[PDB]
Amino acid sequence: GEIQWMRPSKEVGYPIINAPSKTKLEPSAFHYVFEGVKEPAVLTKNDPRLKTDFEEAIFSKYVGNKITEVDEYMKEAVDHYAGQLMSLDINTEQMCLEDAMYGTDGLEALDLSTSAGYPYVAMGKKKRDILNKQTRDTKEMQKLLDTYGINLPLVTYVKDELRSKTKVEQGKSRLIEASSLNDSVAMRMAFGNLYAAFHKNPGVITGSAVGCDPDLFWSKIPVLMEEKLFAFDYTGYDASLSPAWFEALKMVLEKIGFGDRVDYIDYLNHSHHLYKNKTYCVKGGMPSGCSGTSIFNSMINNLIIRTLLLKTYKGIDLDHLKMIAYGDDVIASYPHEVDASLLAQSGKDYGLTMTPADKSATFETVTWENVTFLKRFFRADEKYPFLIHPVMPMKEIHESIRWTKDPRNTQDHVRSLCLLAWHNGEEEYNKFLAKIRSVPIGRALDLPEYSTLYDRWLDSF
Numbered sequence: 148g149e150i151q152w153m154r155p156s157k158e159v160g161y162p163i164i165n166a167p168s169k170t171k172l173e174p175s176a177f178h179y180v181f182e183g184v185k186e187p188a189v190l191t192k193n194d195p196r197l198k199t200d201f202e203e204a205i206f207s208k209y210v211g212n213k214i215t216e217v218d219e220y221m222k223e224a225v226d227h228y229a230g231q232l233m234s235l236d237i238n239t240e241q242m243c244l245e246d247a248m249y250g251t252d253g254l255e256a257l258d259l260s261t262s263a264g265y266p267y268v269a270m271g272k273k274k275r276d277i278l279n280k281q282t283r284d285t286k287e288m289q290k291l292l293d294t295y296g297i298n299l300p301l302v303t304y305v306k307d308e309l310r311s312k313t314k315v316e317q318g319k320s321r322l323i324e325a326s327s328l329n330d331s332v333a334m335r336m337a338f339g340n341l342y343a344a345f346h347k348n349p350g351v352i353t354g355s356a357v358g359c360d361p362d363l364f365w366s367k368i369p370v371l372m373e374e375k376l377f378a379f380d381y382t383g384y385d386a387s388l389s390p391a392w393f394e395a396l397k398m399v400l401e402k403i404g405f406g407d408r409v410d411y412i413d414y415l416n417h418s419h420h421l422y423k424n425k426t427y428c429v430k431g432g433m434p435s436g437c438s439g440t441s442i443f444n445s446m447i448n449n450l451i452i453r454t455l456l457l458k459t460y461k462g463i464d465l466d467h468l469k470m471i472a473y474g475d476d477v478i479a480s481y482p483h484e485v486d487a488s489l490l491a492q493s494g495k496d497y498g499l500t501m502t503p504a505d506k507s508a509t510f511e512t513v514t515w516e517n518v519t520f521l522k523r524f525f526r527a528d529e530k531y532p533f534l535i536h537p538v539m540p541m542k543e544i545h546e547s548i549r550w551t552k553d554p555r556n557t558q559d560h561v562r563s564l565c566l567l568a569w570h571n572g573e574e575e576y577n578k579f580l581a582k583i584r585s586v587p588i589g590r591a592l593d594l595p596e597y598s599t600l601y602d603r604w605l606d607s608f
Protein backbone atom coordinates (compact mmCIF):
# COMPACT_ATOMS: atom_id res chain seq x y z
CA GLY A 148 0.00 0.00 0.00
CA GLU A 149 1.34 3.37 -1.14
CA ILE A 150 -0.08 6.83 -1.95
CA GLN A 151 1.02 8.03 -5.39
CA TRP A 152 -0.24 11.61 -5.06
CA MET A 153 -2.62 13.73 -2.98
CA ARG A 154 -4.04 17.20 -3.57
CA PRO A 155 -7.02 19.63 -3.24
CA SER A 156 -10.18 17.90 -4.53
CA LYS A 157 -11.17 21.27 -5.99
CA GLU A 158 -8.24 21.14 -8.39
CA VAL A 159 -9.92 18.09 -9.98
CA GLY A 160 -13.64 18.76 -9.62
CA TYR A 161 -14.44 17.00 -6.35
CA PRO A 162 -16.53 18.57 -3.56
CA ILE A 163 -15.03 18.79 -0.07
CA ILE A 164 -16.27 15.92 2.13
CA ASN A 165 -17.96 16.83 5.42
CA ALA A 166 -17.27 14.57 8.38
CA PRO A 167 -18.56 15.32 11.92
CA SER A 168 -15.67 16.66 14.02
CA LYS A 169 -17.19 15.44 17.27
CA THR A 170 -17.26 11.85 18.56
CA LYS A 171 -20.64 10.24 19.25
CA LEU A 172 -19.13 8.30 22.15
CA GLU A 173 -20.05 9.55 25.62
CA PRO A 174 -19.51 7.94 29.04
CA SER A 175 -22.31 5.48 29.80
CA ALA A 176 -24.40 4.82 32.89
CA PHE A 177 -21.79 2.16 33.62
CA HIS A 178 -18.66 4.30 33.15
CA TYR A 179 -17.69 4.39 36.84
CA VAL A 180 -18.91 0.89 37.75
CA PHE A 181 -16.33 -0.83 35.51
CA GLU A 182 -12.65 -0.25 34.79
CA GLY A 183 -11.36 0.95 31.44
CA VAL A 184 -8.51 2.91 29.89
CA LYS A 185 -9.67 3.40 26.30
CA GLU A 186 -11.12 6.69 24.98
CA PRO A 187 -12.68 7.92 21.71
CA ALA A 188 -10.23 7.99 18.79
CA VAL A 189 -8.99 11.34 17.50
CA LEU A 190 -11.39 12.55 14.82
CA THR A 191 -9.72 15.83 13.88
CA LYS A 192 -6.36 17.58 13.55
CA ASN A 193 -7.11 19.87 16.49
CA ASP A 194 -7.70 17.22 19.18
CA PRO A 195 -5.70 18.56 22.20
CA ARG A 196 -4.67 14.98 22.99
CA LEU A 197 -2.50 14.80 19.85
CA LYS A 198 1.31 14.63 19.97
CA THR A 199 2.02 14.51 16.23
CA ASP A 200 0.37 15.55 13.00
CA PHE A 201 -2.97 13.80 12.49
CA GLU A 202 -2.36 13.59 8.73
CA GLU A 203 1.07 11.99 8.96
CA ALA A 204 -0.48 9.48 11.36
CA ILE A 205 -3.72 8.29 9.80
CA PHE A 206 -1.91 7.75 6.51
CA SER A 207 1.37 6.31 7.76
CA LYS A 208 -0.33 2.90 7.54
CA TYR A 209 0.68 2.83 3.86
CA VAL A 210 4.23 1.51 4.50
CA GLY A 211 4.77 0.96 0.78
CA ASN A 212 4.81 -1.92 -1.69
CA LYS A 213 7.57 -4.42 -1.03
CA ILE A 214 7.14 -6.83 -3.94
CA THR A 215 6.60 -6.20 -7.63
CA GLU A 216 5.93 -9.46 -9.45
CA VAL A 217 4.14 -12.68 -8.43
CA ASP A 218 6.94 -15.18 -7.88
CA GLU A 219 7.13 -18.97 -8.10
CA TYR A 220 6.10 -19.59 -4.50
CA MET A 221 3.07 -17.31 -4.80
CA LYS A 222 2.14 -19.02 -8.04
CA GLU A 223 2.24 -22.39 -6.30
CA ALA A 224 0.27 -20.99 -3.39
CA VAL A 225 -2.33 -19.82 -5.92
CA ASP A 226 -2.62 -23.20 -7.63
CA HIS A 227 -3.08 -25.07 -4.35
CA TYR A 228 -5.60 -22.62 -2.84
CA ALA A 229 -7.53 -22.41 -6.11
CA GLY A 230 -7.53 -26.20 -5.98
CA GLN A 231 -9.34 -26.43 -2.62
CA LEU A 232 -11.88 -23.75 -3.45
CA MET A 233 -12.62 -25.83 -6.52
CA SER A 234 -14.18 -28.59 -4.40
CA LEU A 235 -16.92 -26.18 -3.34
CA ASP A 236 -18.50 -26.12 -6.79
CA ILE A 237 -18.92 -22.40 -6.35
CA ASN A 238 -21.72 -21.20 -8.62
CA THR A 239 -19.79 -18.98 -11.02
CA GLU A 240 -22.87 -17.13 -12.34
CA GLN A 241 -23.73 -13.49 -11.82
CA MET A 242 -26.18 -12.30 -9.18
CA CYS A 243 -29.48 -10.73 -10.26
CA LEU A 244 -29.59 -7.06 -9.25
CA GLU A 245 -32.42 -7.88 -6.84
CA ASP A 246 -30.68 -10.51 -4.68
CA ALA A 247 -27.51 -8.40 -4.66
CA MET A 248 -29.59 -5.60 -3.13
CA TYR A 249 -31.99 -7.39 -0.75
CA GLY A 250 -30.11 -10.62 -0.05
CA THR A 251 -30.70 -14.34 -0.60
CA ASP A 252 -29.40 -17.54 1.05
CA GLY A 253 -25.76 -17.05 1.98
CA LEU A 254 -25.83 -13.27 1.57
CA GLU A 255 -27.49 -10.54 3.62
CA ALA A 256 -29.15 -7.44 2.22
CA LEU A 257 -27.16 -4.22 1.86
CA ASP A 258 -26.62 -2.28 5.08
CA LEU A 259 -28.65 0.93 5.38
CA SER A 260 -26.51 2.59 8.05
CA THR A 261 -23.18 2.84 6.19
CA SER A 262 -22.38 5.84 3.98
CA ALA A 263 -23.89 5.88 0.49
CA GLY A 264 -20.55 7.21 -0.66
CA TYR A 265 -19.84 9.58 -3.53
CA PRO A 266 -21.60 11.23 -5.21
CA TYR A 267 -24.72 10.73 -3.08
CA VAL A 268 -22.84 11.77 0.07
CA ALA A 269 -22.11 15.16 -1.48
CA MET A 270 -25.57 15.47 -3.11
CA GLY A 271 -27.49 14.67 0.05
CA LYS A 272 -29.26 11.47 -1.05
CA LYS A 273 -29.14 8.61 1.52
CA LYS A 274 -29.53 4.83 1.21
CA ARG A 275 -33.19 4.86 2.27
CA ASP A 276 -33.87 7.15 -0.71
CA ILE A 277 -32.87 4.46 -3.24
CA LEU A 278 -33.48 1.11 -1.57
CA ASN A 279 -36.70 -0.05 0.03
CA LYS A 280 -36.91 -3.46 1.73
CA GLN A 281 -40.64 -3.73 0.96
CA THR A 282 -40.71 -4.15 -2.85
CA ARG A 283 -37.09 -4.94 -3.64
CA ASP A 284 -37.33 -2.33 -6.39
CA THR A 285 -34.35 -2.48 -8.75
CA LYS A 286 -35.57 0.56 -10.72
CA GLU A 287 -34.24 3.45 -8.63
CA MET A 288 -30.91 1.61 -8.32
CA GLN A 289 -30.84 0.14 -11.83
CA LYS A 290 -31.36 3.70 -13.05
CA LEU A 291 -28.70 5.29 -10.82
CA LEU A 292 -26.07 2.83 -12.06
CA ASP A 293 -26.47 4.07 -15.63
CA THR A 294 -26.37 7.67 -14.46
CA TYR A 295 -23.15 7.72 -12.41
CA GLY A 296 -21.56 4.44 -13.55
CA ILE A 297 -19.51 1.98 -11.48
CA ASN A 298 -15.89 2.29 -10.38
CA LEU A 299 -16.46 5.44 -8.30
CA PRO A 300 -14.18 7.15 -5.72
CA LEU A 301 -14.00 6.00 -2.14
CA VAL A 302 -15.05 8.43 0.58
CA THR A 303 -12.63 8.36 3.51
CA TYR A 304 -13.98 8.86 7.05
CA VAL A 305 -12.05 8.62 10.34
CA LYS A 306 -13.57 5.78 12.36
CA ASP A 307 -15.40 6.82 15.53
CA GLU A 308 -14.43 4.16 18.07
CA LEU A 309 -12.54 3.41 21.31
CA ARG A 310 -8.74 3.24 21.19
CA SER A 311 -5.92 2.91 23.71
CA LYS A 312 -4.37 6.12 25.06
CA THR A 313 -1.16 5.64 23.07
CA LYS A 314 -3.00 5.10 19.83
CA VAL A 315 -4.83 8.33 20.69
CA GLU A 316 -1.73 10.41 21.39
CA GLN A 317 0.08 9.07 18.32
CA GLY A 318 -3.00 9.83 16.23
CA LYS A 319 -3.28 6.18 15.19
CA SER A 320 -6.97 6.56 14.35
CA ARG A 321 -8.46 4.27 11.73
CA LEU A 322 -10.05 5.30 8.44
CA ILE A 323 -13.11 3.96 6.68
CA GLU A 324 -12.73 3.85 2.90
CA ALA A 325 -16.37 3.73 1.70
CA SER A 326 -17.47 2.59 -1.75
CA SER A 327 -20.38 4.15 -3.64
CA LEU A 328 -23.64 2.23 -3.47
CA ASN A 329 -23.07 1.55 -7.17
CA ASP A 330 -19.66 -0.12 -6.79
CA SER A 331 -20.96 -2.08 -3.83
CA VAL A 332 -23.97 -3.29 -5.85
CA ALA A 333 -21.90 -4.06 -8.94
CA MET A 334 -19.49 -6.21 -6.96
CA ARG A 335 -22.24 -8.04 -5.11
CA MET A 336 -23.69 -8.95 -8.50
CA ALA A 337 -20.29 -9.89 -9.85
CA PHE A 338 -19.09 -11.87 -6.82
CA GLY A 339 -22.38 -12.46 -5.04
CA ASN A 340 -22.37 -16.24 -5.31
CA LEU A 341 -18.74 -16.34 -4.23
CA TYR A 342 -19.74 -14.51 -1.05
CA ALA A 343 -22.63 -16.88 -0.43
CA ALA A 344 -20.41 -19.95 -0.83
CA PHE A 345 -17.95 -18.52 1.68
CA HIS A 346 -20.57 -17.47 4.22
CA LYS A 347 -22.07 -20.96 4.06
CA ASN A 348 -18.75 -22.79 4.37
CA PRO A 349 -16.62 -21.34 7.12
CA GLY A 350 -13.73 -23.69 7.74
CA VAL A 351 -10.51 -25.05 6.33
CA ILE A 352 -11.81 -25.55 2.81
CA THR A 353 -12.38 -21.86 2.30
CA GLY A 354 -9.83 -21.12 4.98
CA SER A 355 -12.20 -18.37 6.03
CA ALA A 356 -14.38 -17.77 9.04
CA VAL A 357 -16.43 -14.96 7.53
CA GLY A 358 -20.15 -15.30 8.31
CA CYS A 359 -19.40 -17.66 11.17
CA ASP A 360 -21.26 -17.91 14.49
CA PRO A 361 -18.69 -18.31 17.31
CA ASP A 362 -21.07 -20.07 19.69
CA LEU A 363 -21.30 -22.96 17.23
CA PHE A 364 -18.11 -22.72 15.19
CA TRP A 365 -15.64 -22.92 18.09
CA SER A 366 -16.62 -26.56 18.63
CA LYS A 367 -15.93 -27.40 14.98
CA ILE A 368 -12.48 -25.80 14.80
CA PRO A 369 -10.30 -28.11 16.94
CA VAL A 370 -11.48 -31.05 14.86
CA LEU A 371 -10.46 -29.29 11.63
CA MET A 372 -6.92 -28.39 12.77
CA GLU A 373 -3.81 -30.54 12.41
CA GLU A 374 -1.64 -31.63 15.34
CA LYS A 375 0.56 -28.51 15.65
CA LEU A 376 -0.92 -24.99 15.78
CA PHE A 377 0.91 -21.83 14.75
CA ALA A 378 -0.28 -18.22 14.68
CA PHE A 379 0.66 -14.54 14.43
CA ASP A 380 -0.91 -11.14 13.84
CA TYR A 381 0.04 -8.61 11.23
CA THR A 382 0.55 -4.92 11.69
CA GLY A 383 -1.27 -2.86 9.08
CA TYR A 384 -2.26 -5.95 7.12
CA ASP A 385 -4.81 -4.22 4.89
CA ALA A 386 -2.57 -1.28 3.99
CA SER A 387 0.58 -3.37 3.57
CA LEU A 388 -0.72 -5.57 0.76
CA SER A 389 1.26 -4.94 -2.43
CA PRO A 390 -0.30 -5.02 -5.93
CA ALA A 391 1.19 -8.47 -6.56
CA TRP A 392 -1.04 -9.99 -3.85
CA PHE A 393 -4.09 -8.66 -5.70
CA GLU A 394 -2.83 -10.25 -8.93
CA ALA A 395 -2.39 -13.56 -7.15
CA LEU A 396 -5.98 -13.05 -5.98
CA LYS A 397 -7.20 -12.47 -9.56
CA MET A 398 -5.35 -15.62 -10.58
CA VAL A 399 -7.35 -17.56 -8.03
CA LEU A 400 -10.60 -15.95 -9.16
CA GLU A 401 -9.67 -16.74 -12.77
CA LYS A 402 -9.02 -20.41 -11.95
CA ILE A 403 -12.44 -20.89 -10.33
CA GLY A 404 -14.71 -19.25 -12.91
CA PHE A 405 -14.51 -15.52 -12.32
CA GLY A 406 -11.95 -14.44 -14.91
CA ASP A 407 -14.92 -12.41 -16.12
CA ARG A 408 -14.84 -9.63 -13.57
CA VAL A 409 -11.33 -9.77 -12.15
CA ASP A 410 -11.32 -6.11 -13.18
CA TYR A 411 -13.11 -5.15 -9.98
CA ILE A 412 -10.15 -6.44 -8.04
CA ASP A 413 -8.19 -3.80 -9.91
CA TYR A 414 -10.10 -0.96 -8.24
CA LEU A 415 -9.51 -2.38 -4.77
CA ASN A 416 -5.80 -2.44 -5.68
CA HIS A 417 -5.38 0.83 -7.60
CA SER A 418 -7.86 3.15 -5.93
CA HIS A 419 -9.24 6.69 -5.98
CA HIS A 420 -9.93 8.35 -2.57
CA LEU A 421 -11.63 11.48 -1.13
CA TYR A 422 -10.80 12.57 2.44
CA LYS A 423 -12.21 15.92 3.59
CA ASN A 424 -11.02 18.50 1.03
CA LYS A 425 -8.04 16.53 -0.33
CA THR A 426 -7.93 13.80 -2.99
CA TYR A 427 -5.44 10.98 -3.46
CA CYS A 428 -4.62 7.89 -5.45
CA VAL A 429 -3.44 4.69 -3.79
CA LYS A 430 -1.36 1.91 -5.41
CA GLY A 431 -1.96 -1.31 -3.47
CA GLY A 432 -3.77 -1.72 -0.16
CA MET A 433 -7.17 -3.24 0.57
CA PRO A 434 -9.80 -0.51 1.19
CA SER A 435 -11.94 -1.15 4.27
CA GLY A 436 -15.47 -0.39 3.09
CA CYS A 437 -16.01 -2.42 -0.09
CA SER A 438 -18.20 -5.40 -0.76
CA GLY A 439 -15.94 -8.37 -0.25
CA THR A 440 -13.18 -6.57 1.65
CA SER A 441 -13.54 -9.12 4.41
CA ILE A 442 -13.56 -12.15 2.09
CA PHE A 443 -10.86 -10.94 -0.28
CA ASN A 444 -8.57 -10.27 2.67
CA SER A 445 -9.12 -13.86 3.84
CA MET A 446 -8.34 -15.27 0.41
CA ILE A 447 -5.14 -13.27 0.21
CA ASN A 448 -4.29 -14.48 3.72
CA ASN A 449 -4.68 -18.05 2.53
CA LEU A 450 -2.22 -17.17 -0.24
CA ILE A 451 0.27 -15.47 2.11
CA ILE A 452 0.56 -18.35 4.63
CA ARG A 453 0.91 -20.82 1.74
CA THR A 454 3.56 -18.67 0.08
CA LEU A 455 5.70 -18.20 3.21
CA LEU A 456 5.52 -21.96 3.89
CA LEU A 457 6.55 -22.91 0.35
CA LYS A 458 9.51 -20.56 0.44
CA THR A 459 10.69 -21.49 3.92
CA TYR A 460 10.07 -25.26 3.98
CA LYS A 461 10.58 -26.63 0.49
CA GLY A 462 8.59 -29.82 0.33
CA ILE A 463 5.97 -28.84 2.88
CA ASP A 464 2.62 -30.56 2.25
CA LEU A 465 0.01 -27.82 1.81
CA ASP A 466 -2.71 -30.50 1.77
CA HIS A 467 -2.03 -30.68 5.49
CA LEU A 468 -1.96 -26.98 6.06
CA LYS A 469 -5.20 -26.48 8.00
CA MET A 470 -5.91 -22.79 8.46
CA ILE A 471 -8.84 -20.45 9.01
CA ALA A 472 -8.65 -16.73 8.49
CA TYR A 473 -10.86 -13.74 9.14
CA GLY A 474 -9.29 -10.86 7.26
CA ASP A 475 -5.91 -10.41 8.96
CA ASP A 476 -6.69 -12.63 11.95
CA VAL A 477 -5.70 -16.28 11.43
CA ILE A 478 -5.42 -19.61 13.21
CA ALA A 479 -3.36 -22.33 11.49
CA SER A 480 -1.95 -25.79 11.93
CA TYR A 481 0.40 -28.41 10.48
CA PRO A 482 1.31 -32.02 11.45
CA HIS A 483 4.81 -30.80 12.29
CA GLU A 484 6.01 -27.82 14.27
CA VAL A 485 7.22 -24.78 12.33
CA ASP A 486 9.16 -21.66 13.19
CA ALA A 487 6.70 -18.74 13.26
CA SER A 488 9.60 -16.33 13.76
CA LEU A 489 11.33 -17.69 10.66
CA LEU A 490 8.05 -17.44 8.72
CA ALA A 491 7.78 -13.87 10.01
CA GLN A 492 11.14 -13.15 8.43
CA SER A 493 9.98 -14.32 4.98
CA GLY A 494 6.92 -12.19 5.60
CA LYS A 495 8.88 -8.94 5.53
CA ASP A 496 10.20 -9.91 2.10
CA TYR A 497 6.59 -9.97 0.91
CA GLY A 498 5.64 -6.67 2.54
CA LEU A 499 3.99 -8.17 5.58
CA THR A 500 4.84 -7.29 9.18
CA MET A 501 4.12 -10.35 11.29
CA THR A 502 4.59 -10.57 15.04
CA PRO A 503 4.07 -13.08 17.89
CA ALA A 504 0.43 -14.09 18.16
CA ASP A 505 -1.27 -11.62 20.52
CA LYS A 506 1.33 -8.88 21.06
CA SER A 507 3.57 -11.42 22.87
CA ALA A 508 7.21 -10.51 23.47
CA THR A 509 8.37 -13.32 21.22
CA PHE A 510 7.20 -16.35 19.32
CA GLU A 511 6.36 -19.15 21.71
CA THR A 512 4.60 -22.47 21.13
CA VAL A 513 0.88 -22.14 20.40
CA THR A 514 -1.49 -24.33 22.38
CA TRP A 515 -5.24 -24.80 22.83
CA GLU A 516 -4.78 -23.08 26.17
CA ASN A 517 -3.26 -19.86 24.81
CA VAL A 518 -4.50 -19.58 21.24
CA THR A 519 -7.04 -16.87 20.45
CA PHE A 520 -9.04 -16.24 17.31
CA LEU A 521 -11.09 -13.04 17.06
CA LYS A 522 -9.93 -11.99 20.53
CA ARG A 523 -11.61 -15.18 21.83
CA PHE A 524 -10.05 -18.21 23.54
CA PHE A 525 -11.12 -21.85 23.32
CA ARG A 526 -12.29 -23.60 26.49
CA ALA A 527 -14.04 -26.95 26.61
CA ASP A 528 -17.17 -26.89 28.77
CA GLU A 529 -16.83 -28.52 32.22
CA LYS A 530 -19.99 -30.63 32.05
CA TYR A 531 -19.72 -31.50 28.33
CA PRO A 532 -16.08 -31.14 27.07
CA PHE A 533 -16.99 -31.87 23.46
CA LEU A 534 -18.65 -28.45 23.37
CA ILE A 535 -16.13 -25.59 23.09
CA HIS A 536 -16.61 -22.18 24.64
CA PRO A 537 -15.44 -19.24 22.60
CA VAL A 538 -14.11 -17.06 25.44
CA MET A 539 -13.89 -13.29 25.03
CA PRO A 540 -11.86 -11.71 27.86
CA MET A 541 -13.92 -9.64 30.31
CA LYS A 542 -11.58 -6.67 29.94
CA GLU A 543 -12.83 -6.20 26.37
CA ILE A 544 -16.41 -6.24 27.60
CA HIS A 545 -15.61 -3.91 30.51
CA GLU A 546 -14.08 -1.47 28.02
CA SER A 547 -17.08 -1.54 25.72
CA ILE A 548 -19.77 -1.11 28.36
CA ARG A 549 -18.28 2.07 29.88
CA TRP A 550 -19.30 4.03 26.74
CA THR A 551 -22.27 4.67 24.45
CA LYS A 552 -23.26 6.22 21.12
CA ASP A 553 -27.01 6.09 21.57
CA PRO A 554 -28.91 5.66 24.86
CA ARG A 555 -31.72 4.11 22.83
CA ASN A 556 -29.46 1.14 22.00
CA THR A 557 -28.39 0.52 25.60
CA GLN A 558 -30.62 -2.54 25.85
CA ASP A 559 -29.22 -4.16 22.71
CA HIS A 560 -25.64 -3.12 23.45
CA VAL A 561 -25.61 -4.67 26.93
CA ARG A 562 -27.57 -7.73 25.84
CA SER A 563 -24.84 -8.28 23.22
CA LEU A 564 -22.08 -7.98 25.77
CA CYS A 565 -23.94 -10.56 27.83
CA LEU A 566 -23.94 -13.11 25.02
CA LEU A 567 -20.15 -12.74 24.90
CA ALA A 568 -19.48 -12.63 28.64
CA TRP A 569 -21.26 -15.67 30.04
CA HIS A 570 -18.73 -18.01 28.42
CA ASN A 571 -16.39 -16.77 31.15
CA GLY A 572 -18.32 -18.95 33.59
CA GLU A 573 -21.31 -18.49 35.87
CA GLU A 574 -19.33 -16.84 38.66
CA GLU A 575 -17.89 -14.09 36.43
CA TYR A 576 -21.16 -13.59 34.60
CA ASN A 577 -23.13 -12.99 37.83
CA LYS A 578 -20.62 -10.36 39.07
CA PHE A 579 -21.02 -8.69 35.68
CA LEU A 580 -24.83 -8.67 36.04
CA ALA A 581 -24.52 -7.44 39.62
CA LYS A 582 -22.50 -4.36 38.70
CA ILE A 583 -24.84 -3.73 35.80
CA ARG A 584 -27.80 -3.74 38.20
CA SER A 585 -26.00 -1.52 40.71
CA VAL A 586 -27.29 1.62 38.97
CA PRO A 587 -30.78 2.66 37.76
CA ILE A 588 -30.13 2.15 34.05
CA GLY A 589 -28.92 -1.41 34.50
CA ARG A 590 -31.75 -2.47 36.78
CA ALA A 591 -34.25 -1.51 34.05
CA LEU A 592 -32.74 -3.75 31.35
CA ASP A 593 -34.01 -7.22 30.44
CA LEU A 594 -30.86 -9.37 30.71
CA PRO A 595 -30.71 -13.21 30.48
CA GLU A 596 -29.51 -15.09 33.54
CA TYR A 597 -26.70 -17.61 33.30
CA SER A 598 -28.81 -20.75 33.30
CA THR A 599 -30.97 -19.43 30.46
CA LEU A 600 -27.94 -18.75 28.27
CA TYR A 601 -26.05 -21.98 29.03
CA ASP A 602 -29.11 -24.13 28.32
CA ARG A 603 -29.94 -22.39 25.07
CA TRP A 604 -26.29 -23.00 24.11
CA LEU A 605 -26.40 -26.73 24.87
CA ASP A 606 -29.49 -27.22 22.67
CA SER A 607 -28.21 -25.06 19.79
CA PHE A 608 -26.04 -27.77 18.28
Ligand SMILES: Nc1ccn([C@@H]2O[C@H](COP(=O)(O)OP(=O)(O)OP(=O)(O)O)[C@@H](O)[C@H]2O)c(=O)n1
Binds near residue numbers: 319324383385474475
Ligand atom coordinates in the same frame (compact mmCIF):
# COMPACT_ATOMS: atom_id res chain seq x y z
N1 LIG B 1 -11.90 0.91 9.22
C1 LIG B 1 -10.98 -0.01 9.56
C2 LIG B 1 -9.61 0.33 9.57
C3 LIG B 1 -8.72 -0.64 9.88
N2 LIG B 1 -9.15 -1.90 10.21
C4 LIG B 1 -8.19 -2.98 10.58
O1 LIG B 1 -7.40 -2.53 11.65
C5 LIG B 1 -6.01 -2.84 11.38
C6 LIG B 1 -5.14 -1.85 12.12
O2 LIG B 1 -5.63 -1.63 13.44
P1 LIG B 1 -4.65 -1.51 14.71
O3 LIG B 1 -5.22 -2.89 15.31
O4 LIG B 1 -5.08 -0.18 15.19
O5 LIG B 1 -3.26 -1.69 13.91
P2 LIG B 1 -2.46 -3.08 14.09
O6 LIG B 1 -1.03 -2.86 13.39
O7 LIG B 1 -3.22 -4.21 13.54
O8 LIG B 1 -2.20 -3.18 15.68
P3 LIG B 1 -0.92 -3.97 16.27
O9 LIG B 1 0.39 -3.08 15.98
O10 LIG B 1 -1.12 -3.95 17.86
O11 LIG B 1 -0.76 -5.36 15.77
C7 LIG B 1 -5.93 -2.84 9.86
O12 LIG B 1 -4.85 -3.60 9.37
C8 LIG B 1 -7.26 -3.49 9.47
O13 LIG B 1 -7.22 -4.91 9.49
C9 LIG B 1 -10.53 -2.20 10.21
O14 LIG B 1 -10.92 -3.34 10.53
N3 LIG B 1 -11.41 -1.22 9.88
Ligand SMILES: [Mn+2]
Binds near residue numbers: 381
Ligand atom coordinates in the same frame (compact mmCIF):
# COMPACT_ATOMS: atom_id res chain seq x y z
MN1 LIG C 1 -3.36 -6.19 14.71
Ligand SMILES: [Mn+2]
Ligand atom coordinates in the same frame (compact mmCIF):
# COMPACT_ATOMS: atom_id res chain seq x y z
MN1 LIG D 1 -3.77 -3.06 17.61
Ligand SMILES: [Mn+2]
Binds near residue numbers: 380381475476
Ligand atom coordinates in the same frame (compact mmCIF):
# COMPACT_ATOMS: atom_id res chain seq x y z
MN1 LIG E 1 -6.06 -8.73 14.59
Ligand code: NA
Binds near residue numbers: 415416417418431432
Ligand atom coordinates in the same frame (compact mmCIF):
# COMPACT_ATOMS: atom_id res chain seq x y z
NA1 NA F 1 -5.96 0.59 -2.54
